[PDB]
Design an enzyme around this catalytic site. Structure first.
Site, PDB file in Angstrom:
ATOM      1  N   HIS A   1     -41.638   1.162  17.371  1.00 36.61           N
ATOM      2  CA  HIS A   1     -40.696   1.752  16.163  1.00 36.61           C
ATOM      3  C   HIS A   1     -39.972   2.914  16.850  1.00 36.61           C
ATOM      4  CE1 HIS A   1     -42.791  -1.175  13.612  1.00 36.61           C
ATOM      5  NE2 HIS A   1     -44.175  -0.705  14.298  1.00 36.61           N
TER       6      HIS A   1
ATOM      7  N   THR B   1     -47.556  -2.526   9.114  1.00 36.31           N
ATOM      8  CA  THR B   1     -46.538  -1.870   8.601  1.00 36.31           C
ATOM      9  C   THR B   1     -45.112  -2.687   8.349  1.00 36.31           C
ATOM     10  OG1 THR B   1     -45.652  -1.074  10.699  1.00 36.31           O
ATOM     11  CG2 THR B   1     -47.554   0.124   9.819  1.00 36.31           C
TER      12      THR B   1
ATOM     13  N   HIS C   1     -36.450  -7.316  14.472  1.00 36.52           N
ATOM     14  CA  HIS C   1     -36.936  -6.173  13.989  1.00 36.52           C
ATOM     15  C   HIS C   1     -37.339  -5.044  15.001  1.00 36.52           C
ATOM     16  CE1 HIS C   1     -37.174  -8.647  10.380  1.00 36.52           C
ATOM     17  NE2 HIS C   1     -37.961  -9.448  10.981  1.00 36.52           N
TER      18      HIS C   1
ATOM     19  N   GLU D   1     -44.098   6.070  12.529  1.00 36.15           N
ATOM     20  CA  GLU D   1     -44.187   5.443  11.239  1.00 36.15           C
ATOM     21  C   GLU D   1     -45.501   6.594  10.803  1.00 36.15           C
ATOM     22  OE1 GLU D   1     -45.056   1.088  11.753  1.00 36.15           O
ATOM     23  OE2 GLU D   1     -43.034   1.069  10.841  1.00 36.15           O
TER      24      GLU D   1
ATOM     25  N   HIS E   1     -45.279  -3.549  20.712  1.00 34.68           N
ATOM     26  CA  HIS E   1     -43.879  -3.194  20.229  1.00 34.68           C
ATOM     27  C   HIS E   1     -43.870  -1.729  19.984  1.00 34.68           C
ATOM     28  CE1 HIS E   1     -46.186  -4.126  16.614  1.00 34.68           C
ATOM     29  NE2 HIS E   1     -45.336  -3.056  16.165  1.00 34.68           N
TER      30      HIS E   1
ATOM     31  N   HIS F   1     -47.406   0.341  19.236  1.00 38.60           N
ATOM     32  CA  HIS F   1     -48.137  -0.290  18.609  1.00 38.60           C
ATOM     33  C   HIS F   1     -48.875  -1.312  19.338  1.00 38.60           C
ATOM     34  CE1 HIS F   1     -46.763   1.107  14.532  1.00 38.60           C
ATOM     35  NE2 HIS F   1     -47.643   1.919  15.215  1.00 38.60           N
TER      36      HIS F   1
HETATM   37 ZN   LIG Z   1     -45.531  -1.784  14.489  1.00 32.85          ZN
END
Ligand SMILES: [Zn+2]
Length: 258
Positions: free
Chosen positions: A94, A196, A62, A104, A92, A117
């Site tokens: 996104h 999330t 992911h 996000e 991590h 994050h």
């Molecule tokens: Zn995250």
């Protein structure tokens, strides 16, 4: 198999296995800067990462997670909206396929190229697995990335991504200093929300920094070369691993700053 970010398994599908997807405190959200109210009683954040002990970097299909030793108070977040002590366990990102999307959270509907994050858990619950079941179990420090000058503190992360190209790959990642991922200002917005990604647990105090960090186009380009798939499987580039903004539902977003 299970969940992801594609047309067939992405955010529009998550609610079938994780009905809390349509709950009352889901994340991310749009931060409307005209509606967020300064809360003069909010404390400054205390980011105490001097003794941070990174261990490993893992492609989990992911994103990639940089993991920390959270057996004791070594890297912690305190203050701000938080009561007590939250231990850093992982960070991590996104990110998008293009520079105009990937974050996000959004700010007045603006999407950033990426979002970092830093994930912490409340030490009063003893371990992370227990903490994620509690409404005040987690605190995630969210930082926006825009494309500009390179972020020197990110480069060791970028350097190792070739070695964890595919899902399930990990590499040793000791002696990384997460302080080099922070912007200058610790001004922030805060609201109660959720993970999330599945299982979308409503267990997070979100602390989203006002100031983005700048990363270079080469740095984000390397994130986009990662793979969602496992080794020996058809290549699917790891891009657009973000959930879109969710309804605020009359939660209030507070600002640390005037
Ligand atoms: Zn995250």
């Amino acid at each position: 198999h299970h969940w992801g970010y594609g047309k067939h398994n992405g955010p529009e599908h998550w609610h079938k296995d994780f009905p809390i997807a349509k709950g009352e405190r889901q994340s991310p959200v749009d931060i409307d800067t005209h509606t967020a109210k300064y809360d003069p009683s909010l404390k400054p954040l205390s980011v105490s990462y001097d003794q941070a002990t990174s261990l490993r970097i893992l492609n989990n299909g992911h994103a990639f997670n940089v993991e920390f030793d959270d057996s004791q108070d070594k890297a912690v977040l305190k203050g701000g909206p938080l009561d007590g002590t939250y231990r850093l366990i992982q960070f991590h990102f996104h990110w998008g396929s293009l520079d105009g999307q990937g974050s996000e959270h959004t700010v007045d509907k603006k999407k950033y190229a990426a979002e970092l994050h830093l994930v912490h858990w409340n030490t009063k619950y003893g371990d992370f697995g227990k903490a994620v079941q509690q409404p005040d179990g987690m605190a995630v420090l969210g930082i926006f990335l825009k494309v500009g000058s390179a972020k020197p503190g990110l480069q060791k992360v970028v350097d190792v991504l070739d070695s964890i190209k595919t899902k399930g790959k990990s590499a040793d990642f000791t002696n990384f200093d997460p302080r080099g991922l922070l912007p200058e200002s610790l001004d922030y917005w805060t609201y109660p929300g959720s993970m999330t990604t599945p299982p979308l647990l409503e267990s997070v105090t979100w602390i989203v920094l006002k100031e983005p960090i700048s990363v270079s186009s080469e740095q984000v380009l390397k994130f986009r070369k990662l793979n969602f798939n496992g080794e020996g499987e058809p290549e699917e580039l790891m891009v657009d691993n973000w959930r879109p903004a969710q309804p605020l539902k009359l939660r209030q977003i507070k600002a640390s700053f005037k």
